[PDB]
């Protein structure tokens, strides 16, 4: 005895928008979030651009005093819960709330708390370091922080899959409800990582773009791409069972269907050259939602922007689902939000699914001519989606999709 | 078709040994792997005890050039793998690798590696950050890192629950191989976090115990408890269905047959005062195990030597199980090993049933007044354990218990 698992709600925080609105308004004029560096000095770095959430607005929900407990990285997701919880209608009074759970996917955690005590250490030594350090840079805490605000009692944890986090923390809210053993999730992903060491770190890497102009740093599927641009932000989703939310009468907004994780076990930053990890999590995730690869109507890339990535992820779209398919990265947009990218995107999905329209891979102007798979970028594409996947393929070889079925 | 879960071998690094046998004779003999910190320069601390790996076998697998792609708390998972992988002479050449899947729980990650590469990005710029930095420490990388050397296919994942995050691991293999999506799964948790950062973090929080003498610093349920010792190291175990173990004719070391976690949603440090959560995640287990409260023949507790701890898990046991089930803190002996306690406690659980014998809670002389569970110190006790139960309660109001079986 399974339940379908549907979407009632959720909520953003993103470089392009705070709420679906604005979010979904950027998408479809193509306005980017990418801009030059704000958040610290990078004249020292080859890396100058970011895509910052530059109009967080804490005020709505947060006073000042909160930021001696929270992190950013737990702030945007705390706001984006809200957000989803305020967008489904939940009425957390009117819930058993040991079958209400919470997942916070983050790839880093608190990041900044991190760097900044650690300097404090060195500098003034151990009494200098702040008592709520840990509290605030522990990737678990932003689940906690979410679970304690709405009294969540169920399940609750964070998973890290790197760039996966948030598609597999979907797929395990999903695979909890399906099977039986919560009824009602607040599940999604956060990441603040806009800083001097995580910049420095992925630069270091040679992960990311050094490309001075915004506009053409964050291209998925383009021959000049060079590394991704990184974002910031959260996307939080409000699941239940669809029983749950027949029963509250409550307002579906999409369908989980399918959910396929496997790992290259290949190298610990290359993917898989010829995309076969990502090809069988495509495949796990069709068979579950028991649809034919035809029935894609729409693929979100992972589409980080770097030359590998590309190069197979379109093999591997190609393989399974073919060459109609339309396709695109919405990372063009938001950069590459780690942790949290899983959730926006899987925003973003949903979004296109309600919108009848294929967002495009903005900046993008000329495909790599080896990827046959078809990359939508210069304008957006009107079409019915159905059923559209959600890629994520992370540094470790974790490779997560998520298949969501159009609500009727 | 539900399956039945069981263990077929386990490694182990820790502070008290890195193999099962040596392991189980510290336990066995009352030698404590508590002592004066040498992982780095503590002068100017309050804390100056830790349970540290001062013997880890590095040139088993290793070559000097790993260290240059591994922080330590991915050799720990690596080497716990191996050790389990050929305890469980498990010829992973031969296996369904696309049903073969890896999770490595790690509170914090390589924070050393962190640390380091901060000072190093604000002494020398950021042109000397380490291009390896990042997949060093990401807390998911040593997940990726452990099914590359095995070849593993499926489930890759990291949980991070703090101190539940293996016991959430193991769950949650457990649930996946239950369930059918996999056969086999090497499952575990690695800490590494004995470094003036982490050490810093817990002392300004004030949960770490000042204790100088170190055969009293880590006295769990003892009336003059204080707070934890920090400890380092990994478990990991191999679990296969049933089918799986008979069909190539496997030594069955024990079966998980119930997980339970619920979240306190109360406090980001403290714990739930009566023990609620606690409460439920206990009775989950139980439900799932289909056994009754006097099935429970051992309580491996989380016992980490705090005031609120030991009051709050007394309860809770004492509420579901009773005044007569003997209870034991191994964190006594091996520290608490944060993202790595459920694993290595999920090992002694495993052991205790294989040695009819209850391991004592060492250092402990006096217990609590108010505490009314059947705490063993002094020495240990001999009995069967055809069942037991781990309990692990983290920061972030996380709680996890797993049901263990003996086999049997």
């Not at 009468?249 to 610990?268: F, K, Q, R």
């Not at 090809?279 to 939602?289: M, P, Q, R, S």
């Not at 922007?305 to 073919?322: C, D, F, Y």
Request: aromatic share 8%.
């Amino acid at each position: 005895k399974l339940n379908r698992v549907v979407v009632t709600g959720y909520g953003v925080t993103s470089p392009i928008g705070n709420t679906p609105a604005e979010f979904w308004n950027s998408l479809a004029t193509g306005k980017i979030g990418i801009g030059g560096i704000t958040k610290f000095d990078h004249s020292d770095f080859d890396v100058h651009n970011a895509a910052e959430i530059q109009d967080f607005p804490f005020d709505k929900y947060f006073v000042k005093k909160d930021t001696n407990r929270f992190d950013n990285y737990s702030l945007y997701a705390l706001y984006a819960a809200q957000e989803a919880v305020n967008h489904a209608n939940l009425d957390v009074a009117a819930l058993n709330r040991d079958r209400f759970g919470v997942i916070v996917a983050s790839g880093i955690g608190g990041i900044k708390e991190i760097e900044d005590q650690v300097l404090r250490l060195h500098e003034k030594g151990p009494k200098r370091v702040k008592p709520m350090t840990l509290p605030k840079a522990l990737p678990n805490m932003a689940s906690g922080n979410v679970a304690m605000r709405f009294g969540a009692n169920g399940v609750c944890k964070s998973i890290n899959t790197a760039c996966s986090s948030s598609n597999d923390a979907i797929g395990d809210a999903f695979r909890s409800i399906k099977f039986g053993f919560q009824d009602v999730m607040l599940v999604g992903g956060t990441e603040a990582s806009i800083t001097p060491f995580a910049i420095a770190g992925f630069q270091a890497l040679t992960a990311l773009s050094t490309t001075e102009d915004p506009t053409r740093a964050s291209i998925p599927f383009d021959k000049d791409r060079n590394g991704f641009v990184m974002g910031e932000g959260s996307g939080m989703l409000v699941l239940e069972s669809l029983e749950h939310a027949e029963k509250r009468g409550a307002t579906i907004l999409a369908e989980v269907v399918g959910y396929g994780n496997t790992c290259d076990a290949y190298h610990m930053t290359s993917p898989h050259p010829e995309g076969q990890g990502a090809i069988k999590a495509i495949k796990l995730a069709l068979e579950e939602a028991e649809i034919s690869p035809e029935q894609v109507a729409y693929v979100n890339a992972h589409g980080t922007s770097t030359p590998a990535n590309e190069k197979g992820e379109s093999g591997a779209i190609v393989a399974v689902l073919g060459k109609a398919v339309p396709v695109s990265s919405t990372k063009s947009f938001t950069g590459h939000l780690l942790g949290a990218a899983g959730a926006v995107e899987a925003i973003v999905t949903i979004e296109a699914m309600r919108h009848n329209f294929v967002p495009m891979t903005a900046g993008t102007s000329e495909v790599s001519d080896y990827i046959e798979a078809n990359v939508v970028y210069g304008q957006g594409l009107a079409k019915e989606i159905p059923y559209a996947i959600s890629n994520t393929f992370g540094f470790g070889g974790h490779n997560a999709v998520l298949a969501f079925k159009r609500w009727a």
